Ligand binder design. Structure first.
Ligand SMILES: Nc1nc2c(ncn2[C@@H]2O[C@H](COP(=O)(O)OP(=O)(O)OP(=O)(O)O)[C@@H](O)[C@H]2O)c(=O)[nH]1
Ligand SMILES: [Mg+2]
Lengths: 357, 432
C-alpha cells in the first residue's frame, strides 16, 4: 500500500526500501539526489571467458549520476559510476545504468544523513491510482490519463463529421460516440482507472458516458459541463469545481487551485506571492510561506546551487507549517510555472520587494 | 443582382431562428405542407412554438433542447439582393460556431428580445447580446440591423416605451464599440406573429422606420478583393455522391475556377477543383463573397477539416509557427501572463495558442509603448504579444488579408480578448 522504509545504521545514513507502486517510484524521483549511492541487484555482461560473454546477476553500489521518471511506465531510470561490486569482474569506475521497477529492493546511502521529513515523505505514498478524462463535442474528442504524478494525452481527434444538413448525420454521430466510448473503456481498463471523467458542452458527453457505464458498470463515471471538447476541454475540466473535488487527492489537480490564487494575487495583492528559486528561499526563511508549488525538474536541476536552494526553501516551509506541492513539468499547471522559474509561493502576509534579500 | 452573407446573432432564445424561418415563409420560400408538418411534429413532441425555428434547427440535440447548435444556411432574395442568411447559435456553449458565422458574414441581424428579464439577460456582463456584438465587431462586421423582437409578448405588447428603452441601452454600448449607431436601424418586430418583417405592422403606428426587408435593401455590398491571393477558409467538409469530397466555405480573397489546383493549409494536401456549386447552382468561377461548395479530386474527407484554408499552390495560405498581435483584454479575472494559453478564433478556425512573450503594454488612449515586457496584463490593457499555436494554424497579417488576421481570444467559456495580427513567423511549406 506504501513504500516500506527502514533505516539501517545508527548514523541514519543508510535506508533500505522497496517501491510497491508507481507513486513510490515518483516519491523516489523527487527524493533521490545526485551523489546518493544506491545498491541494487542488477546484472551485466561480463567477458568470462574466451571471446564469450555471460550475463551475470550481481550487486553493485552506484554513485547516482542521473534519476529519471516518465509517468505510466512503472520504471525509475537510474544511472551512475559504479563505486563497488564483486572484484572478480572489475566494474568499479564503470557506468551502470538500469531501472528501478516496482518491487525492486534498493539500499541508498546519503552522506549528509536522512532527515526525518525525507523518511516520512518516502512512506507517505498512498497508492492512489489513476483516472481518465475525456472531452467531446461535434468538433473534437480527446482522452487523457491522470495520476498524482503525471498526465498523458491518449487520444486527440477531429470528429470529421458531416455538417448538420447531411442525410444520415445522425448515424455518423452515433458511430462517433461509440468510438469515443470504446476508447474510454480501453484506456480505463489499460490503466486500472476507478474513475472516468467525461466532459463537454451539451448531450454528447452523456451519450458517451451512458455507453461506457454500461460496458464497465463498476466504474465511477462523472459528466462535467465544459465549453468545448478536445484537449482544451480536458484542461478546462481539470478546473471545474466538480472535478477539483472528485480528483482533489491528485497534485496535478490541486496545483490548479494554488495557481488560480497565485494569479489573483499577482493582480490584486502582489506582495503576498513569490516566485523564482531565489525569491522563494528568501521568503521561506522569513516564515512567510503558506504553500509552495514546485515543478519537479527544479529538484534535479544541473546547477548544484539551485538544487540546494530549492531543497532548503522546501525544508524551511515544511518546518514552519507550510504545504509543499511538487508536480511534473509535464502538466497543465507545470507548464504555466516555467515562466515563473518553476516555483511559486503563496505568502501568509505581505512581504515588500525591498525585503526579499 | 449582388450577393451578401447575413449572420443572425443574439442571446439564447431571443428568436433568431423563428425570425429567419418566418421571414422566409412570408417571402414565399417555404411550402404550406412543410410548415404545417413541422407544426404537427413540434406540437407532438415537447416543443410547440418552434415550428418556425425548426425550419432551421434540424440536429437531434437541437430539436430536443431546443437550441441552435451549428450554423444553418439558406438562400433568398429581395428587390435589390440575393442573400445567404446564416442562422447562428445563441447558447454560450456554442459561440465558437457563432464566430465562424460572423467571419463569413457581410452583415448581421442582431436579434434582441424586449421581454422583461430577457433583454437584461442578454445585455448583462455575461450575456450574448453583448458578446455577439463584441465578436461581430472584432470579426469585421460593420453593417448591422437590430431587430427588437418579441414585441407581441404579453409583457411587452407593442409598447413604444419598452422599445425605446432597449434601443437606448443598445445604442450606448454599440457606440462604445465604435459603431456609428445613428446610421443603423432598430426595427421593432414580432418574429412569431410577423410584425414588421415584410409589411408595416398595424399594432405599432409609432414606428415609421423601415421594415426588416426594407432594412435589408439598404445594406451596401462590400468590396471584392480580387488581385489578392486566393483564400477560402473551409467551414465544413462533405462526402457527396456524384461529387466526391467537397469543402464548403466563403471565398475571402482572389478567384477560384473549375480546373484550378488548390492546396489546403495546414495539412498541405493538394487536389484539383472539379466543380463549384453555390445555392445549388453550377458556377465556373467563384468571386470573393461567394459561399460555395467545391469538389476536389484527389483529396479525401479525412485529409481536410473546418478551419483549414484553401489557396492556389502559387501562393499558399500562411501557416504560423508563431505570430505577433496587437491585442486588447476585454475580461479576465486576474493576471494574464507569458504561458497563458487561450484559444484563438480566426476565420473558421479555433486553436489554442501559448503567449510566449508580452512585448509591450500600450497606452490605452494614444497607443505608445508604455512598458516593455510587463509582468502581466489585466482587463483592459492593450498590448503587443507573441503567440505560439499549439497545433498548426493558418493566419495572415491584418494589413495583408484582414479577414484571416483578426481574432478573438477565448478561455473558459468567456471572451477574454480581441486582436489583430501584426506579424507572422511562417512554418515551412510541406506539400502532398
Ligand atoms: N411571443 C414571441 N415569442 C417568440 C418570438 N420570437 C421567438 N419566440 C419564442 O422564443 C423561443 C425561442 O425561439 P428560437 O427561434 O429557437 O430562438 P433562438 O434565438 O433562435 O434560439 P437559439 O438559437 O437557441 O439561441 C421560441 O419558443 C419562440 O416561439 C416573438 O417574436 N414573439
Ligand atoms: Mg436558433
Amino acid at each position: 500500500s506504501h513504500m516500506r522504509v527502514e533505516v539501517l545504521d545508527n548514523k541514519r545514513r543508510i535506508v533500505r526500501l522497496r517501491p510497491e507502486s508507481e507513486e513510490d517510484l515518483w516519491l523516489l524521483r523527487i527524493t533521490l539526489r545526485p551523489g546518493d549511492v544506491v545498491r541494487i541487484r542488477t546484472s551485466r555482461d561480463v567477458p568470462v571467458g574466451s571471446g564469450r560473454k555471460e550475463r551475470v546477476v550481481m550487486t553493485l553500489r552506484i554513485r547516482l549520476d542521473s534519476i529519471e521518471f516518465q509517468p505510466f511506465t512503472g520504471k525509475l531510470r537510474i544511472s551512475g559510476i559504479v563505486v563497488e561490486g564483486p572484484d572478480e569482474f572489475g566494474v568499479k569506475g564503470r557506468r551502470h545504468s538500469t531501472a528501478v521497477s516496482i518491487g525492486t529492493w534498493l539500499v541508498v546511502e546519503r552522506d549528509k544523513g536522512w532527515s526525518e521529513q525525507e523518511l516520512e515523505r518516502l512512506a507517505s505514498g498512498r497508492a492512489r491510482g489513476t483516472a481518465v478524462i475525456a472531452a467531446v463535442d461535434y468538433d473534437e474528442f480527446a482522452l487523457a490519463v491522470l495520476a498524482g504524478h503525471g498526465m498523458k494525452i491518449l487520444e486527440d481527434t477531429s470528429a470529421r463529421l458531416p455538417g448538420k444538413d447531411d442525410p444520415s448525420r445522425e448515424q455518423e454521430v452515433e458511430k462517433y460516440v461509440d468510438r469515443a466510448a470504446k476508447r474510454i473503456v480501453e484506456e480505463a481498463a489499460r490503466h486500472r482507472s476507478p474513475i472516468a471523467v467525461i466532459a463537454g458542452p451539451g448531450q454528447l458527453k452523456t451519450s458517451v458516458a451512458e455507453k461506457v457505464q454500461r460496458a464497465m458498470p463498476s466504474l465511477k463515471v462523472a459528466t462535467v459541463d465544459t465549453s468545448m471538447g478536445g484537449v482544451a476541454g480536458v484542461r478546462e475540466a481539470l478546473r471545474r469545481e466538480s472535478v477539483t473535488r472528485i480528483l482533489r487527492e491528485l497534485s496535478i489537480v490541486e496545483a490548479e487551485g494554488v495557481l488560480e490564487e497565485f494569479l489573483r494575487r499577482i493582480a490584486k495583492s502582489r506582495d503576498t506571492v513569490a516566485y523564482t528559486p531565489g525569491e522563494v528561499l528568501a521568503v521561506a526563511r522569513m516564515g512567510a510561506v503558506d504553500t509552495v508549488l514546485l515543478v519537479d525538474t527544479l529538484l534535479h536541476s544541473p546547477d548544484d546551487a539551485v538544487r540546494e536552494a530549492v531543497d532548503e526553501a522546501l525544508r524551511l516551509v515544511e518546518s514552519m507549517g507550510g504545504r509543499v506541492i511538487i508536480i511534473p513539468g509535464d502538466s497543465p499547471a507545470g507548464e504555466r510555472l516555467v515562466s515563473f522559474g518553476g516555483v511559486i509561493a503563496l505568502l501568509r502576509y505581505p512581504v515588500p520587494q525591498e525585503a526579499r534579500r | 443582382k449582388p450577393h451578401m452573407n447575413l449572420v443572425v446573432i443574439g442571446h439564447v432564445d431571443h428568436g433568431k431562428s423563428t425570425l429567419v424561418g418566418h421571414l422566409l415563409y412570408r417571402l414565399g420560400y417555404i411550402e404550406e405542407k412543410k410548415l404545417k408538418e413541422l407544426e404537427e411534429q413540434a406540437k407532438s413532441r415537447g416543443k410547440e412554438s418552434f415550428k418556425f425555428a425548426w425550419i432551421l434547427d434540424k440536429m437531434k440535440e437541437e430539436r430536443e433542447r431546443g437550441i441552435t447548435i451549428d450554423l444553418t444556411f439558406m438562400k433568398f432574395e429581395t428587390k435589390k439582393y440575393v442573400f445567404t442568411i446564416i442562422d447562428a447559435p445563441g447558447h454560450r456553449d456554442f459561440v465558437k460556431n457563432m464566430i465562424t458565422g460572423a467571419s463569413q458574414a457581410d452583415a448581421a441581424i442582431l436579434v434582441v428580445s424586449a421581454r422583461k428579464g430577457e433583454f437584461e439577460a442578454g445585455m448583462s456582463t455575461e450575456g450574448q447580446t453583448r458578446e455577439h456584438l463584441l465578436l461581430a465587431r472584432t470579426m469585421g462586421i460593420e453593417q448591422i440591423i437590430v431587430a427588437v423582437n418579441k414585441m407581441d409578448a404579453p409583457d411587452v405588447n407593442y409598447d413604444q416605451k419598452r422599445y425605446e428603452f432597449v434601443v437606448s441601452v443598445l445604442k450606448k454600448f454599440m457606440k462604445g464599440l465604435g459603431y456609428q449607431v445613428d446610421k443603423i436601424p432598430f426595427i421593432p418586430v414580432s418574429a412569431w406573429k410577423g410584425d414588421n418583417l415584410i409589411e408595416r405592422s398595424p399594432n405599432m403606428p409609432w414606428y415609421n422606420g423601415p421594415t426588416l426587408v426594407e432594412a435589408l435593401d439598404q445594406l451596401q455590398p462590400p468590396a471584392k478583393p480580387v488581385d489578392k491571393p486566393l483564400r477560402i477558409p473551409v467551414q465544413n467538409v462533405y462526402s457527396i455522391p456524384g461529387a466526391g469530397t467537397v469543402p464548403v466555405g466563403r471565398v475571402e480573397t482572389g478567384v477560384l475556377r473549375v480546373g484550378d489546383k488548390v492546396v489546403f493549409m495546414p495539412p498541405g494536401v493538394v487536389g484539383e477543383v472539379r466543380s463549384i456549386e453555390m445555392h445549388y447552382q453550377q458556377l465556373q468561377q467563384a468571386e470573393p463573397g461567394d459561399n460555395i461548395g467545391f469538389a476536389v479530386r484527389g483529396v479525401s474527407k479525412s485529409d481536410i477539416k473546418r478551419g483549414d484554408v484553401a489557396g492556389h499552390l502559387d501562393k499558399p495560405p500562411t501557416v504560423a509557427e508563431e505570430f505577433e498581435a496587437r491585442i486588447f483584454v476585454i475580461w479576465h479575472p486576474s493576471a494574464i501572463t507569458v504561458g497563458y494559453t487561450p484559444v484563438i478564433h480566426v476565420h473558421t478556425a479555433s486553436v489554442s495558442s501559448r503567449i510566449i512573450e508580452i512585448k509591450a503594454k500600450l497606452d490605452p488612449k494614444t497607443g505608445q509603448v508604455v512598458e516593455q515586457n510587463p509582468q502581466f496584463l489585466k482587463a483592459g490593457d492593450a498590448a503587443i504579444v507573441r503567440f505560439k499555436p499549439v497545433k498548426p494554424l493558418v493566419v495572415e497579417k491584418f494589413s495583408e488579408i484582414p479577414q484571416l488576421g483578426r481574432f478573438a481570444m477565448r478561455d473558459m467559456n468567456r471572451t477574454v480578448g480581441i486582436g489583430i495580427v501584426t506579424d507572422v513567423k511562417p512554418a515551412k511549406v510541406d506539400i502532398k
